[PDB]
Amino acid sequence: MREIVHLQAGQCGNQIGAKFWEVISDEHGIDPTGTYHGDSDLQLERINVYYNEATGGKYVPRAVLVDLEPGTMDSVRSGPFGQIFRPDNFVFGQSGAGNNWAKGHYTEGAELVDSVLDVVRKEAESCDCLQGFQLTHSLGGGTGSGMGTLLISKIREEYPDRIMNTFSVVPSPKVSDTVVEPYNATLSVHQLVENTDETYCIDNEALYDICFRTLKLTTPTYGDLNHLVSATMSGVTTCLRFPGQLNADLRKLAVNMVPFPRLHFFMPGFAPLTSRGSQQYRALTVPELTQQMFDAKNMMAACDPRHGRYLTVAAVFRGRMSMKEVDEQMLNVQNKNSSYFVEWIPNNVKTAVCDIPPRGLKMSATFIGNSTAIQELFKRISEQFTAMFRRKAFLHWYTGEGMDEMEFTEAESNMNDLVSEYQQYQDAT
């Protein structure tokens, strides 16, 4: 058994993880009371990956819920799927971070890490063979950014050999929600390159772009974006839960994708996305799935890969299919636009196949791709940071907590080193 301990963090983390646990309980046939009612026997033998064993045949999710205010905790607890979670796993505080990275990381958030650590060690020592962890948060907040990073940099040195995934939501360039968010984004990106193994960059307006042109969704609330994130959140760990012709866990997608220990930022994607009006006017085949995966309008980060070079491309397929019209199509896409793949790796493609599709879909596929076009997100976050820091716009909300003012300078320096390192590995012959 290879079980994942799920770590929600903040408002973004909780709103994503509620929907994620909904789709996981949908796939395994778990009712909100916590029992099993699936129509097949293939949904139970690998339920220990996400579900712990309680009394009476009750399956409790492997989640700890972290927040710095009780506003979102009480909402997710009173939701339709809020009664599966363990009552003790709700750990929250009284005073919030207030969209401050420093409050979430140093002063207010440091009060709470010693209880989330208690719940995490409570939950990880019950594991027989623990595979790794999983964190959901946002980089533009105060307790998703600060407290989440403190959790990342505090559970890594206790368990120094596991696989750590973060489904971070980095700030959008165009649409904005928080004035002070370049500070939090820079100060969390500087720390996200030392204590992570896989990081999935997701932009809100990229999901809006998907909903507005691919899905043709007209009034997409946050639930639809949560489903878009969570479908590929469950499309990566799918080979542990179901058999397949070619299995790949998190680590098999880690060794095969990151070439160097400081290049672990990918752009996710989901293949069979169509409107409700185009439900029946589509043949769900592999040439219709890989063509949409590599389309520039499909990635959930607002960085066009045509501006860069694909370092490595991973693809996890779901549903009953063979292995000719997978590999021939991936060869064709490697040979057609060969200018976008690095020449110093001859085969840039990793492929896994599972034969248990999501319900209501014949076939599905999840894209994970490491590209050096991610430098245009970092450099533009840095430009908006340095348009703010040189006039000391909001530094008194950060300096007044004991944080030394040099920390912004070294965070900016490390961000620039990341951008330059991505730049050298692009034109390298």
Partner: protein
């Protein structure tokens, strides 16, 4: 007294051995639950004094998802409950992992079960190891398993049926490292190594068989038929019987050169066999056709140095001699100067059995051709090019050094394969 222990390591080994043992159970009198509904079964099956036949195989894999289907489905009754060895985690596409860190705590159980299988053996002819180069446990644990099998048993012949990485298509990125590092160890601990390629079998299934859209099962059925033709003369009488030790005396001229090919000649569908005469003269020409080999290397670029022919069915030596002479007199096929004979023949009266639901036809004639050429050197040259292209910037070495391995291993394996690579040039001239 003519027994052959099979070892299946990895997902490729297990998914090959499933088809292999389905064919073995159909060929003899063994029911899927191990019962009887005449001593040919003793090579592959053991005997209990209650009517139960137990296979002489071990299914070893580190991930549990592949072997758990074997102990759940139809043939769950046939295998011993212990003979399916299973670990907790996998090697994660890492030769270093499965060879130094995870494969070390599993090898004792596999060695103990191999010893207990050999205790039932009184006339042990040799071993049959099935694995793949591109994986982690198929490259790391297979190398360690053969490496301690040589010290356990000595000069007993261990035959290899390895899935070589394909030139054009690939399922992984890090596979040149594994394929470099395991051939540094499968040189001194492997008496023979029959090589197969996935895309060549894809082209064979597309053209010769009617099956477009072929899964891995159709790939494994052909390997099962070939490996039944290899050991057919042990279990059934023939005009000219061949042994396992009768292969390497006439197929392996030098101990560095033990990489021959395999070719099943009358690969034909049920509809197409209804129109085609499949006499000896018509199917001996299909063995030497470069489009019908199962490795993507062209023998027109090289020269044959040996040829082992094993016939099945109602083959008279008349037509065998009269067709080998016809193969000799045409100059598309050429031989080396230092072999003037270049042929070994074998005839078994028992026709090849048919699996129901497979895409093979009922045939009274079949020949499995084994031959090593100098045209396999281009595969080593291409894999060499991929390694020294990827090893220049050290593209993935941190995933190997931290799991129990050094820097100089790649270098010394690489110059060892330089010696292997141009040891073929002194032979073909």
């Amino acid at each position: 007294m003519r027994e052959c222990i099979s070892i299946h390591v990895g997902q490729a080994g297990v998914q090959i051995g499933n088809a292999c043992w389905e064919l073995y159970c159909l060929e003899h009198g063994i029911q899927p639950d191990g019962q009887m509904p005449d001593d040919s079964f003793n090579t592959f099956f053991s005997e209990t004094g209650a009517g139960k036949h137990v296979p002489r195989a071990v299914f070893v894999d580190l991930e549990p998802t592949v072997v758990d289907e074997v102990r759940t489905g139809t043939y769950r009754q046939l295998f011993h409950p212990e003979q399916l060895i299973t670990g907790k985690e996998d090697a994660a596409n890492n030769y270093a992992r499965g060879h130094y860190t995870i494969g070390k705590e599993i090898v004792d159980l596999v060695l103990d079960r191999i010893r207990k299988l050999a205790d039932l053996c009184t006339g042990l002819q040799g071993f049959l190891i099935f694995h793949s180069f591109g994986g982690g446990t198929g490259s790391g644990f297979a190398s360690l398993l053969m490496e301690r099998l040589s010290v356990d048993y000595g000069k007993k012949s261990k035959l290899e049926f390895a899935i070589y990485p394909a030139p054009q298509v690939s399922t992984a990125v890090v596979e040149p490292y594994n394929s470099i590092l395991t051939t540094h160890t499968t040189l001194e601990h492997s008496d023979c190594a029959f090589m197969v390629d996935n895309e060549a079998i894809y082209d064979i299934c597309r053209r010769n068989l009617d099956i477009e859209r072929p899964t891995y099962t159709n790939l494994n059925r052909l390997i099962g038929q070939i490996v039944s033709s290899i050991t057919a003369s042990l279990r059934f009488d023939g005009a000219l019987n061949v042994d396992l030790t009768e292969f390497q005396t006439n197929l392996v001229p030098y101990p560095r050169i033990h990489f021959p090919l395999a070719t099943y000649a009358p690969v034909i569908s049920a509809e197409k066999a209804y129109h085609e005469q499949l006499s000896v003269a018509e199917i001996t020409n299909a063995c030497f056709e470069p489009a019908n080999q199962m490795v993507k290397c062209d023998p027109r670029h090289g020269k044959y140095m040996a040829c082992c022919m094993l016939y099945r069915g109602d083959v008279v030596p008349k037509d065998v001699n009269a067709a080998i002479a016809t193969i000799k007199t045409k100059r598309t096929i050429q031989f080396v100067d230092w072999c003037p004979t270049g042929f070994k023949v074998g005839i078994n009266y028992q026709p090849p059995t048919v699996v129901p639901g497979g895409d093979l036809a009922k045939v009274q004639r079949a020949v499995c051709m084994l031959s090593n050429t100098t045209a396999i050197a281009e595969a080593w040259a291409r894999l060499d090019h991929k390694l020294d292209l990827m090893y220049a910037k050290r593209a993935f070495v941190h995933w190997y050094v931290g799991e129990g391995m050094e820097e100089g291993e790649f270098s010394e394996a690489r110059e060892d394969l330089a010696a292997l690579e141009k040891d073929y040039e002194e032979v073909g001239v």
